[PDB]
Design a protein around this ligand. Structure first.
Ligand SMILES: [Zn+2]
Ligand SMILES: [Zn+2]
Ligand SMILES: [Zn+2]
Lengths: 559, 114, 65, 84, 196, 141, 159, 263, 102, 43, 133
DNA sequence: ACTCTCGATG
RNA sequence: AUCGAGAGU
C-alpha cells in the first residue's frame, strides 16, 4: 500500500498558493528558488547547444543556468563544486540536468486527489516570491482557495513523459469534463461580479478607458469598434467591449423567465458572431454552465482558444472593475424601518399559529395524521410553521435591498451567497436543529435551566428569532451552537466515510477499460459492457439537446 | 527570500534600455514603446497628453504585471505624423506645464505668511 | 515595546509625541480624545497608533541585568 | 496468431493515446541527434519537430493494436487518420 | 487574519501610491475581498470595523462585549456626529489614476491577527536526495530534504488520464528502481551476481 | 454571607435561573426598533440569577468582538486560531530559552474589546495589530 | 404524486395520480393483490427486486437508487459512469458488494486483491493454492514498475 | 503666468493646502504620486553596532533609527552611494552619526534622536540633522535604559527614495479631492433614503457653486481644480516638497525625451 | 452490424427530427451547398465524439461518483452519504425500506 | 497558554454534540476541528 | 451610399426599468396607422418625455478603426441630435401584410413594424439611427 | 478509523 | 525507530 503503489518521489515540490489574475489559465507561477532546484535532463544537440552551454556557464544559482552535467562513461560532473565548472565544452551525446524554465510542462496537483482534474499539466512561468501562483478559474477542479492551501508539483524527466503531460493531461484538454459532460471551470469572484456590472445596459464607458481596455486584450485585432453612441458624446456599452474578447463563429441563445427578443429585464442571452446583442452576462452564460459560453467556445473553436478566452475575459473585467470598485458594509444588511416592523409581526403571527395548535393539542382535539403520533404531527406542524415564517420574513427582506445593495449585487451575479444568506443576516436566523428534530430536552423535560419544565414553545425548543445583525440572546446563542457543532461533526465524518467510498469505488472498477473492439472489459477479458456507455461515446463530446419529435400536439407535430 | 531587492524597480539591469520600440504589426503608422523601470506615474501622464494633440488616432498603456516595473505604451497616428514625434511633442508639452506650475506655486508661496 | 516611529499607513512622525501625550492625560487632566487632537494627530491611522501603542518596555526594564 | 492487411475493423482513425506516445517516442529520437525526415521552417524542440513529421505523414512507425483474446492488427502511421 | 474565522493569505504587496486612497489622504494597510462576507455571514467583522472606526476617532474603547444594548444604529449615529457616513463608507480614488472610484467603499480599523504558518517555513522542494536505508525510497519531511508522497490516490489520477509511461517514470526512476537477477527456471531472487 | 452559591449540573436540574437581573425581576408596566428581541419575564420561582451571561464562554471566544452577531461555527474557527496568533506570550521572553517563540514588534491592544478581556489580560499582552482595512475589489489579487 | 402523460390530442400534461407509500417490505405478496398495478410497483430495497424479478430488473433499481442519492443533492452525473459501476456489481450473476466480500473474492490475479484491505492472507491462500497471476492488471504492473496496459501502453510500438 | 495655477489658502511649517487650477487630473495625480514616492531624502541605511545590553534587539533598534527624520534641504548636493566612486561610503555621499547613551541613573534613562551626533565632515551643507519639532526639545523616543545598560552605535545615512523603502518618504498625508459636489458624476453615491442627507459636505463645497437643480442638457465635463494639502514630515519644508515633486516629475519626463535623442 | 444499428438509433431520432423536409427548407432556409456541408460536418463531429480505446473508464466512473459524494452535507428517508454507504455495501440490514405502490 | 491549562480530554451514544447541560460549564465554541471535535472541550 | 427609412413619430410611454441612464420608449408614427416603434435610449445624453414628437432615420452612411474629429471640418449626417449604430438580428413576420425589424445598439434594443420597409431596411450589419429635435 | 509540516520520549 | 499539537476543501 505505502511503498509499492504509492511511493515518495524525487523531482517534486510543494508550496503555499495564492491567486494571480494576469496569468493564463494553463500556467503556474513557479517561484524562483524552486526552479533553481528542480532539474530536467536535456540531451545536448546541434538544435540546442548554443542556449544549452550558456546555462552550464550561468551556473546553478542565477536562474536560467543548471546543475550537474553527465558524460559518455556515466560520470557525474557537479556544476557547483569542481575546479572545471566555468569550463566544460559540451559534447553531443551527453546530458545537462537544468533549471526548469518558462513554458515547460509540469504536473501540478492538490490533495486530496479525487479526480483526473486534481492533476493537470501546466505551463511554467518563473517568478519571484515563494508562492505557486495560478489563474483563479483553475480553482474548482483542484478545489483550492488561497487561505493556506498547500499544493504539490511534479516534474517529468523523459521526452515521451513530457508529451504525455502536454497531450493528454494539460489544463485546456480537461476544460470540458466527462464527469458531468459539462465544463469544470468558470469565472469566479471579482471577475464574475464584474462580468456582469460591466454588462448592464446602464453601464457606459467612454473613449480613454475603451482604448486601454481594448489594448488590455492580447488577441485584440487593433480596430476600435464603432461606438454604439456617436451623438453628444460617443460612448460604448459594456457588452460592446466584452464582445471583443469573444472570438468569431460564436453563437449563443438563452431565454430565462421574462425573455422576448426585447428582454425588458435584460434577460437571457443573445450572442451572434463574437458579439453580444442583449442580456446581462452572469453565471448562467459564463459559469461552469452547460449551455455555457465555455462549453460552446471549447467545442466550436478548440480547447486552446477557450484557454486563451478565460484570460482575456478576465483581464478586461478585472481592469474595468479595478477602476469602478466594489464593496460591502453592514449597511448592506440593514433594511427599511417599516420592513423591520413587517418582519417582526410576520414572525409574531407565526408564534400565535404555534401557540394555537399547542393549545389545540392540549385539548386532545389535534387529529393524528394517519400513521404518525399526535405528538409527531404537532411537531411537524410547528416546525413547518416557523420554517415558513423565516422564509416569509426573509423574502420580505429580499425586496428592500435595492439594485445597489452590494450583497444582492453578488447574489444576482451568482458570485456568492443566496437568499438564505440574506434571510439569516437581515431577517430572522431560524429554527436550530439537531438530529433532524428541534432542540432536545437534555435537562429533565426542559431545554435549559431558564425555562419551566414541559415547555414545547419555540424560544424554548431552539427557535432563534433575531438576525445575525441585531444579535442573538444567550439561550438562542447556545442552541445555535449545538446547531453547527453537529454541522462540524458530520462534516469531518462526511470526509472519512466518503474518503473510503472513493477508494473502493476506484479499486473494483480500476482496471476496466474500452479495448480496441469498442467492448468494455477488465483484466480477465470478461466483458462488462458491450458498448461503452451503451453508445461507445466519450462523455466529454456530449450535451443537452432537445428531441422535438417527443413533445406537443398530434396537430403541431404535423403543423 | 525569493523577494527581489527594491532597487530593481527604478534601476536598469544589464542591457536593458529605458525605451525599447517595436512597430505594431496589426495596424499601420503604429508603434509600441516598452518603458522599463517606470510605472503609472509616468505612463498615465504621457497617455493623457498623447490624446490632446488632435493628429493622434490612438494611445494607451498597460502594466503587463505589477511584480515588474515595466509598462507598454501604444501609439497610432494620422497619415504623415511619426509617433516618435507625437511622443516628443507630448513629453515637451508636459515639461512646460510643470515648469509653468513650479514657478506659479513658488510665486504664490512667497506671498503668504507663516 | 516602545512607541512606533512614524505611523504605518500615513507616515507622520509619532514616537516624538508619547511622553507629551501621557503628560496631557495624567497632569492637565484630559480625556484621550482631546490629547490626541492637541498633539497634531487629526487622521485616525495616525491616531490609533498612539491610543494603542502599549509600552511593555516599562515591564522588561523591570528585569535586573 | 496474426491478422491480414484486410479484415481490419479497429478504428482507421488515430486514438489520442496512440498519437500521444508516437509523438513521445519520436520526440525522443529527434532529441537524440537521430535523423529528421522533414524540412524545419525553423524549429529546434524535439516534440514540435515530431508534430510536423507527423502532420506530413513521414513518420515510419507502426502501431500494433492488441485485441483481448491474443491477437492484433498492424497500422502504419501512413494509414491512420489524424482528426482531433 | 481577522477575528471571526476569516483566515486569508497575502496575495500581493502594493506601495502606498498604487493603493486606493481616501480624500483625507489615508491609505489602507490591508484590502480584503468583499466576496467572503455573504456566505460565512461574519457580520461582527463588519460591526467591529464600524465601532473601531468610531472609537479610534472619539478616543475611547470599543465595547464589543457580547450581550449588550449596543447597536449598529447606536454606533452609526455616533460615527456621523464625527463627519463620516454612518456605515463606514468613504469615497476613494484609484491611486493608479487619481480618478474617483464609482463605488464607495467600507473603510475602517479592524483588529487583525498575524498567524504562524509563513511561506518561507514551508517551501520545500526536492530534486533527488537522500534515501531510506531499508526501502531505498526518498525520506519523509522537509527537515531533511525529503520527497513528496505520490500517494495511491495520485496514481488513480494518472491512470485516469491514460498516462502509462509517466506512471512508470514516477514509480521507478524517481524513488525505488533497482535491478535483480532471476533464475530462468525456479523463477527466484536466488541468483548470484558474480558480476565481472 | 450567602450571596452566591456553587452549582453543578446535577443541582442545576432543580432550579430556575434568571438571565439578566435588571429587566428580569422588576414589576411589569417605546422599543427602540434596532435592539434585539428578548423574550419575557414568564417565570416566578427564580431561586438564583446568572452572574452575567458571557461567562458561558471559554478563554478564547471571550476575545471575540460581538460573537452573538456571528454564525456559530465561525466563532469556533477563530477559537482554534487565536492560539496561532503572534504576540507577546510572556514579559520575560528575553530570559527563557525555549525551542521556537515568536513575538510581534509593535503589539497593539485592540480597538474593539470584550468586558472579559480585563481578566484574560489581553490588553496587557496583546496578539494582533490594529489595521486600517478596506473591503474592496482592486487588482483582483 | 404528479405525472406527465399524453392528452388524447398529443400534448403532455399533468394527470395527478394516487400513490401509496409504505414503511416495510414484502414485494412477494403486494404485487399479487387487487387494484395495484403490478407493472409499476417500486421498492427502494433493490435487493428484494433482484430475488423477485431477476437480475436485469435489479440492475435497473440499483442504478435508480444510486441516482437518487446523487440527484437529491443537485449534482448531475452522466449515466455511463453509474451505469458501469452498477453493471460491474451485477455481472457475476448476483449482486456483488463493493467491499472485500463481493469484488475481492472474484477470481482475479492475487496481486490486485493484495493492493486492498485483506492483504496478507490473500497472499497465503494464493500461495498454498498456487495461483498464477496474469499481470494484465494495472495494480500489478505498478508493483513491478512497468508500462501499464493503459491509454499509452494498451497498444505496442514498432517499425 | 501660463497654464497650471495655484492659490495657497493655509500655510504652516508643515501644511500647504492649495488649489491647483487648469490641469489634467492625470498630472494632479502623477504629481501627488511623485510627491509621495519619488522625492529624495537622507535617512539611516546602515547601523554598525558595538554594544547593546538593552532590552531591545539590535535590528529592532536599527529599524527605528532608519525611520528617524533627518534634515534634507541640501540633499540635492549629496550623491547616491551606488554612484560615487568610493568603496562603501564617503563624506561626499554619506553622513555618519554616533549614539552613545549609558544607563547611569536609578530612574530610567531615555535615549532620544536628540542624542544622535554628527561625525562626518558635512562639507558645510544642511544635511542629516535629526529633525526636532518637539517642544521639550527631544526628537523621537529611540529607546530606554535602566541602571547598567548601554547603546553604542554608528549610523550611516544615505540618499534614497520611497520606492526603495518608505523611510525615504518626505511626506505623510496628501489630501486630495475634486468636484466636491458630484457635478461630473465620477462616483455614484450609495444611499438609504436621501443621497444628500446621508453623506456630508466637505469644506471644499464653499469655494464652488451649487448645481441649481434644473440645469442639464449640454455634456463633456472635465476636471480642472484640485484641492490638495501636503503635510511634510520635516526632512524638507513643505514648499520644497511640492516644488521638488514638480521638478523630479519634470526630470524623469526629460529622461525619456532625452532617451529618444539618445536612440 | 446490428450493434452498430442499435447504438445509433437514438442519435438518428434526433437527426431525423432536425433534418426533415418541412424543417430544413421552411424553418431554417438552407441551400444545397450549405446543406451538404451541414451533412459532411455532422458525420465528422459524430466520429470525433467516439470513445478512444485505452480510455480507463473503470477509474473514471469511480472518481466521477467518488467526488460529488464528498460534496454532500447538511421526507423521512435515508439519503446522501449514509444511503450511498448502504447501497454499495449491498445492505441486507437497511434502515429506510419502503414500497411504492400505484 | 490559558486555554491549554483549561483543557479537557475524553477517551473513546453521541458525546460530540454540544449538550444542553454544558451551558455555563464548558465553552460552546472553543473546540478543535475534525478528528477530535467536541471530545476536547475547554472550560 | 444612401438612406433607408424616414418618419416622424410621437411618444406615448417613457419607461425607466430599474435604470437611470436609459429609458425604453414605445412611440407611434404620425402618418401611417400600421406602424410603431420601440427604442432603448440614453436619456442622460438626450432627454425625451411625455407626448413628444420625434424624427427618425436609419441609413448605412455618413469598416476600419473608428477615427473621430478632424471633422469639425467634415461630412456628417448630423443635422440630427441623437445618433447610434447597431447590428440587426431579426425580421419578424407579424404575419400579413405586416413585418417587424430588430436592431441592437450595443444592447440598446429597437423594434419597428410596417410593410414598405421591405426593399428598404436591408438584412444587414449597417444601421445608423438618427433622431432629431 | 488525503497529503502535510512542527514538538516530544526509552 | 514508537508515540503526543496544529494545515487545507
Ligand atoms: Zn497616520
Ligand atoms: Zn534456479
Ligand atoms: Zn562615496
Amino acid at each position: 500500500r505505502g511503498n509499492l503503489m504509492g511511493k515518495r518521489v524525487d523531482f517534486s515540490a510543494r508550496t503555499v498558493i495564492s491567486g494571480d489574475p494576469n496569468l493564463e489559465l494553463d500556467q503556474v507561477g513557479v517561484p524562483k528558488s524552486i526552479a533553481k532546484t528542480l532539474t530536467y535532463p536535456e540531451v545536448v544537440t546541434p538544435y540546442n547547444i548554443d542556449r544549452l552551454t550558456q546555462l552550464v556557464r550561468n551556473g546553478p544559482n542565477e536562474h536560467p543556468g543548471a546543475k550537474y552535467v553527465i558524460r559518455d562513461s556515466g560520470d557525474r560532473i557537479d556544476l557547483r563544486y569542481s575546479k572545471r565548472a566555468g569550463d566544460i565544452q559540451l559534447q553531443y551525446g551527453w546530458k545537462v540536468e537544468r533549471h526548469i524554465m518558462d513554458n515547460d510542462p509540469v504536473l501540478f496537483n492538490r490533495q486530496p486527489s479525487l479526480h483526473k482534474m486534481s492533476m493537470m499539466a501546466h505551463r511554467v512561468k518563473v517568478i519571484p516570491y515563494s508562492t505557486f501562483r495560478l489563474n483563479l478559474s483553475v480553482t474548482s477542479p483542484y478545489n483550492a482557495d488561497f487561505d493556506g492551501d498547500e499544493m504539490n508539483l511534479h516534474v517529468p524527466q523523459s521526452e515521451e513523459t513530457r508529451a504525455e503531460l502536454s497531450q493528454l493531461c494539460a489544463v485546456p484538454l480537461q476544460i470540458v469534463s466527462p464527469q458531468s459532460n459539462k465544463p469544470c471551470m468558470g469565472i469566479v469572484q471579482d471577475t464574475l461580479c464584474g462580468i456582469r456590472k460591466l454588462t448592464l445596459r446602464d453601464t457606459f464607458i467612454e473613449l480613454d478607458q475603451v482604448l486601454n481596455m481594448l489594448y488590455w486584450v492580447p488577441d485584440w485585432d487593433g480596430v476600435i469598434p464603432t461606438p454604439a453612441i456617436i451623438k453628444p458624446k460617443p460612448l460604448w456599452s459594456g457588452k460592446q467591449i466584452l464582445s471583443v474578447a469573444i472570438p468569431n463563429g460564436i453563437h449563443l441563445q438563452r431565454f430565462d423567465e421574462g425573455t422576448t427578443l426585447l428582454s425588458p429585464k435584460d434577460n437571457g442571452m443573445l450572442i451572434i458572431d463574437g458579439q453580444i446583442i442583449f442580456g446581462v452576462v452572469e453565471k448562467k452564460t459564463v459559469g461552469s454552465s452547460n449551455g455555457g459560453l465555455i462549453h460552446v467556445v471549447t467545442r466550436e473553436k478548440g480547447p486552446q482558444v477557450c484557454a486563451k478566452l478565460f484570460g482575456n475575459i478576465q483581464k478586461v473585467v478585472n481592469f474595468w472593475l479595478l477602476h469602478n470598485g466594489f464593496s460591502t458594509g453592514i449597511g448592506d444588511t440593514i433594511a427599511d424601518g417599516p420592513t423591520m416592523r413587517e418582519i417582526t409581526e410576520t414572525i409574531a403571527e407565526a408564534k400565535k399559529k404555534v401557540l394555537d395548535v399547542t393549545k389545540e393539542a392540549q385539548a386532545n382535539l389535534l387529529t393524528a395524521k394517519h400513521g404518525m403520533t399526535l405528538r409527531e404531527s404537532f411537531e411537524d406542524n410547528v416546525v413547518r410553521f416557523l420554517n415558513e415564517a423565516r422564509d416569509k420574513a426573509g423574502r420580505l427582506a429580499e425586496v428592500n435591498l435595492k439594485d445597489l445593495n452590494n450583497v444582492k449585487q453578488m447574489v444576482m451575479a451568482g458570485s456568492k451567497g443566496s437568499f438564505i444568506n440574506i434571510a439569516q443576516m437581515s431577517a430572522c436566523v431560524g429554527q436550530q436543529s439537531v438530529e433532524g428534530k428541534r432542540i432536545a430536552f437534555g435537562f429533565v423535560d426542559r431545554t435549559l435551566p431558564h425555562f419551566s419544565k414541559d415547555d414545547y414553545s419555540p424560544e424554548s425548543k431552539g427557535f432563534v428569532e433575531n438576525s445575525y445583525l441585531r444579535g442573538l440572546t444567550p439561550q438562542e446563542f447556545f442552541f445555535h451552537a449545538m446547531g453547527g457543532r453537529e454541522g462540524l461533526i458530520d462534516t469531518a465524518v462526511k470526509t472519512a466515510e466518503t474518503g473510503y467510498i472513493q477508494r473502493r469505488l476506484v479499486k473494483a472498477l480500476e482496471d476496466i477499460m474500452v479495448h480496441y473492439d469498442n467492448t468494455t472489459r477488465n483484466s480477465l477479458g470478461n466483458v462488462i459492457q458491450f458498448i461503452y456507455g451503451e453508445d461507445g461515446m466519450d462523455a466529454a463530446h456530449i450535451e443537452k439537446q432537445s428531441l422535438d419529435t417527443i413533445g406537443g400536439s398530434d396537430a403541431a407535430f404535423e403543423k | 527570500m525569493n523577494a527581489p531587492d527594491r532597487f530593481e524597480l527604478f534601476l536598469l539591469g544589464e542591457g536593458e534600455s529605458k525605451l525599447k520600440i517595436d512597430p505594431d504589426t496589426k495596424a499601420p503608422n503604429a508603434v509600441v514603446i516598452t518603458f522599463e523601470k517606470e510605472d503609472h506615474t509616468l505612463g498615465n501622464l504621457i497617455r493623457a497628453e498623447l490624446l490632446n494633440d488632435r493628429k493622434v488616432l490612438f494611445a494607451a498603456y498597460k502594466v503587463e504585471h505589477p511584480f515588474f516595473a515595466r509598462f507598454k505604451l501604444r501609439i497610432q497616428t494620422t497619415e504623415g505624423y511619426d509617433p516618435k514625434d507625437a511622443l516628443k511633442n507630448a513629453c515637451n508639452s508636459i515639461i512646460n506645464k510643470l515648469g509653468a506650475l513650479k514657478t506659479n506655486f513658488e510665486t504664490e508661496w512667497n506671498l503668504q505668511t507663516l | 515595546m516602545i512607541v512606533p516611529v512614524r505611523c504605518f499607513s500615513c507616515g507622520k512622525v509619532v514616537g516624538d509625541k508619547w511622553e507629551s501625550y501621557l503628560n496631557l492625560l495624567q497632569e492637565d487632566e484630559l480625556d484621550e480624545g482631546t490629547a490626541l487632537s492637541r498633539l497634531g494627530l487629526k487622521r485616525y491611522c495616525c491616531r490609533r497608533m498612539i491610543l494603542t501603542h502599549v509600552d511593555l518596555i516599562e515591564k522588561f526594564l523591570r528585569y535586573n541585568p | 496468431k496474426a491478422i491480414p492487411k484486410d479484415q481490419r475493423a479497429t478504428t482507421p482513425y488515430m486514438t489520442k493515446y496512440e498519437r500521444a506516445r508516437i509523438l513521445g517516442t519520436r520526440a525522443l529520437q529527434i532529441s537524440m541527434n537521430a535523423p529528421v525526415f522533414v524540412d524545419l521552417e525553423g524549429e529546434t524542440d524535439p516534440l514540435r519537430i515530431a508534430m510536423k513529421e507527423l502532420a506530413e505523414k513521414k513518420i515510419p512507425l507502426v502501431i500494433r493494436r492488441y485485441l483481448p483474446d491474443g491477437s492484433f492488427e498492424d497500422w502504419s502511421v501512413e494509414e491512420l487518420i489524424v482528426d482531433l | 487574519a481577522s477575528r471571526h474565522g476569516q483566515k486569508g493569505t497575502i496575495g500581493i504587496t502594493y506601495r502606498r501610491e498604487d493603493m486606493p486612497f481616501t480624500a483625507e489622504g489615508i491609505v489602507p494597510d490591508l484590502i480584503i475581498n468583499p466576496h467572503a462576507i455573504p456566505s460565512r455571514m461574519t457580520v461582527a467583522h463588519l460591526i467591529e470595523c464600524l465601532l473601531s472606526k468610531v472609537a479610534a476617532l472619539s478616543g475611547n474603547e470599543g465595547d464589543a462585549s457580547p450581550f449588550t444594548d449596543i447597536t449598529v444604529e447606536g454606533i452609526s449615529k455616533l460615527l456621523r456626529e464625527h463627519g463620516y457616513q454612518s456605515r463606514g463608507f468613504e469615497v476613494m480614488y484609484n491611486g493608479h489614476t487619481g480618478k474617483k472610484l464609482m463605488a464607495q467603499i467600507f473603510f475602517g480599523p479592524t483588529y487583525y491577527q498575524r498567524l504562524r504558518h509563513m511561506v518561507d517555513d514551508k517551501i520545500h522542494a526536492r530534486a533527488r536526495g537522500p534515501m531510506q536505508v531499508l526501502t531505498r525510497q526518498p525520506v519523509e519531511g522537509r527537515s531533511r530534504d525529503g520527497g513528496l508522497r505520490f500517494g495511491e490516490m495520485e496514481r488513480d489520477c494518472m491512470i485516469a488520464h491514460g498516462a502509462a509511461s509517466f506512471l512508470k517514470e514516477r514509480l521507478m526512476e524517481a524513488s525505488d528502481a533497482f535491478r535483480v537477477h532471476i533464475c530462468g527456471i525456479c523463477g527466484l531472487m536466488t541468483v548470484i551476481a558474480k558480476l565481472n | 454571607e450567602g450571596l452566591v452559591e456553587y452549582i453543578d449540573a446535577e443541582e442545576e436540574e432543580s432550579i430556575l435561573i434568571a438571565m439578566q437581573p435588571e429587566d428580569l425581576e422588576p414589576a411589569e408596566a417605546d422599543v427602540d426598533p434596532a435592539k434585539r428581541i428578548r423574550v419575557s419575564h414568564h417565570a416566578t420561582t427564580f431561586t438564583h440569577c446568572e452572574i452575567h451571561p458571557s461567562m458561558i464562554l471559554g478563554v478564547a471566544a471571550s476575545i471575540i468582538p460581538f460573537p452573538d452577531h456571528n454564525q456559530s461555527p465561525r466563532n469556533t474557527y477563530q477559537s482554534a486560531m487565536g492560539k496561532q496568533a503572534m504576540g507577546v506570550f510572556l514579559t520575560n521572553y528575553n530570559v527563557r530559552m525555549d525551542t521556537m517563540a515568536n513575538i510581534l514588534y509593535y503589539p497593539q491592544k485592540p480597538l474593539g474589546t470584550t468586558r472579559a478581556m480585563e481578566y484574560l489580560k489581553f490588553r496587557e499582552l496583546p496578539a494582533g495589530q490594529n489595521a486600517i482595512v478596506a473591503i474592496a475589489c482592486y487588482s483582483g489579487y | 404524486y404528479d405525472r406527465k402523460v399524453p392528452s388524447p390530442t398529443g400534448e403532455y400534461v399533468k394527470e395527478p395520480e394516487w400513490v401509496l407509500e409504505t414503511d416495510g417490505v414484502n414485494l412477494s405478496e403486494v404485487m399479487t393483490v387487487p387494484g395495484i398495478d403490478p407493472t409499476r410497483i417500486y421498492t427502494n430495497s433493490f435487493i428484494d427486486i433482484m430475488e423477485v424479478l431477476g437480475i436485469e430488473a435489479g440492475r435497473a433499481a440499483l442504478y435508480k437508487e444510486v441516482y437518487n442519492v446523487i440527484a437529491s443533492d443537485g449534482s448531475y452525473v452522466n449515466y455511463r459512469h453509474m451505469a458501469l459501476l452498477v453493471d460491474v456489481m451485477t455481472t457475476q450473476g448476483g449482486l456483488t458488494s463493493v467491499t472485500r466480500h463481493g469484488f475481492n473474492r472474484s477470481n482475479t490475479g492475487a496481486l490486485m486483491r493484495c493492493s486492498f484491505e485483506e492483504t496478507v492472507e490473500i497472499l497465503f491462500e494464493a500461495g498454498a493454492s498456487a495461483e498464477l497471476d496474469d499481470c494484465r492488471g494495472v495494480s500489478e504492473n505498478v508493483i513491478l514498475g512497468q508500462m501499464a496496459p493503459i491509454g499509452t501502453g494498451a497498444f505496442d510500438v514498432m517499425i | 503666468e501660463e497654464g497650471p495655477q495655484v492659490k495657497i489658502r493655509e500655510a504652516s511649517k508643515d501644511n500647504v493646502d492649495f488649489i491647483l487650477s487648469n490641469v489634467d487630473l492625470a498630472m494632479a495625480n502623477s504629481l501627488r504620486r511623485v510627491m509621495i514616492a519619488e522625492i529624495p531624502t537622507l535617512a539611516i541605511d546602515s547601523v554598525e553596532v558595538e554594544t547593546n545590553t538593552t532590552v531591545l534587539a539590535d535590528e529592532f533598534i536599527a529599524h527605528r533609527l532608519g525611520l528617524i527624520p533627518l534634515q534634507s534641504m541640501d540633499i540635492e548636493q549629496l550623491e547616491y552611494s551606488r554612484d560615487c566612486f568610493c568603496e562603501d561610503h564617503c563624506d561626499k555621499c554619506s553622513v555618519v552619526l554616533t549614539l552613545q547613551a549609558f544607563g547611569e541613573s536609578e530612574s530610567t534613562t531615555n535615549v532620544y534622536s536628540k542624542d544622535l551626533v554628527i561625525v562626518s565632515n558635512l562639507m558645510g551643507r544642511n544635511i542629516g540633522h535629526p529633525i526636532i519639532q518637539d517642544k521639550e526639545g527631544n526628537g523621537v523616543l529611540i529607546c530606554k535604559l535602566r541602571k547598567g545598560q548601554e547603546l553604542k552605535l554608528t549610523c550611516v545615512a544615505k540618499k534614497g527614495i520611497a520606492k526603495e523603502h518608505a523611510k525615504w518618504g518626505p511626506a505623510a498625508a496628501i489630501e486630495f479631492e475634486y468636484d466636491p459636489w458630484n457635478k461630473l458624476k465620477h462616483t455614484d453615491y450609495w444611499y438609504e433614503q436621501d443621497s444628500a442627507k446621508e453623506w456630508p459636505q466637505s469644506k471644499n463645497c464653499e469655494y464652488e457653486d451649487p448645481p441649481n437643480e434644473g440645469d442639464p442638457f449640454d455634456y463633456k465635463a472635465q476636471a480642472d481644480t484640485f484641492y490638495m494639502n501636503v503635510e511634510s514630515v520635516g526632512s524638507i519644508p513643505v514648499d520644497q516638497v511640492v516644488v521638488r515633486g514638480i521638478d523630479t516629475l519634470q526630470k524623469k519626463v526629460a529622461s525619456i525625451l532625452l532617451a529618444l535623442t539618445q536612440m | 452490424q446490428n450493434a452498430q444499428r442499435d447504438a445509433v438509433t437514438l442519435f438518428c431520432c434526433l437527426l431525423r427530427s432536425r433534418l426533415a423536409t418541412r424543417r430544413v427548407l421552411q424553418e431554417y432556409r438552407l441551400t444545397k451547398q450549405a446543406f451538404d456541408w451541414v451533412l459532411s460536418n455532422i458525420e465528422a463531429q459524430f466520429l470525433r465524439s467516439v470513445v478512444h480505446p485505452g480510455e480507463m473508464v473503470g477509474v473514471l466512473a469511480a472518481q466521477s461518483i467518488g467526488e460529488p459524494a464528498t460534496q454532500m452535507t447538511l421526507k423521512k428517508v435515508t439519503s446522501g452519504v449514509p444511503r450511498l454507504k448502504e447501497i454499495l455495501n449491498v445492505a441486507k440490514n437497511m434502515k429506510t425500506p419502503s414500497l411504492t405502490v400505484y | 497558554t490559558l486555554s491549554h491549562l483549561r483543557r479537557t480530554n475524553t477517551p473513546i451514544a453521541k458525546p460530540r454534540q454540544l449538550h444542553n447541560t454544558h451551558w455555563g460549564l464548558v465553552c460552546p465554541a472553543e473546540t478543535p476541528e475534525g478528528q477530535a471535535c467536541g471530545l476536547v472541550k475547554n472550560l | 451610399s444612401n438612406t433607408l427609412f424616414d418618419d416622424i413619430f410621437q411618444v406615448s410611454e417613457v419607461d425607466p426599468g430599474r435604470y437611470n441612464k436609459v429609458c425604453r420608449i414605445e412611440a407611434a408614427s404620425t402618418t401611417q396607422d400600421q406602424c410603431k416603434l420601440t427604442l432603448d435610449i440614453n436619456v442622460e445624453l438626450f432627454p425625451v418625455a411625455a407626448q413628444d414628437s420625434l424624427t427618425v432615420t436609419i441609413a448605412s452612411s455618413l469598416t476600419r478603426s473608428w477615427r473621430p474629429p478632424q471633422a469639425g471640418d467634415r461630412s456628417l449626417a448630423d443635422d440630427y441630435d441623437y445618433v447610434m449604430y447597431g447590428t440587426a438580428y431579426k425580421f419578424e413576420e407579424v404575419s400579413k401584410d405586416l413585418i417587424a425589424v430588430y436592431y441592437s445598439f450595443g444592447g440598446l434594443l429597437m423594434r419597428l413594424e410596417g410593410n414598405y420597409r421591405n426593399l428598404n431596411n436591408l438584412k444587414q450589419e449597417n444601421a445608423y439611427l438618427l433622431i432629431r429635435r
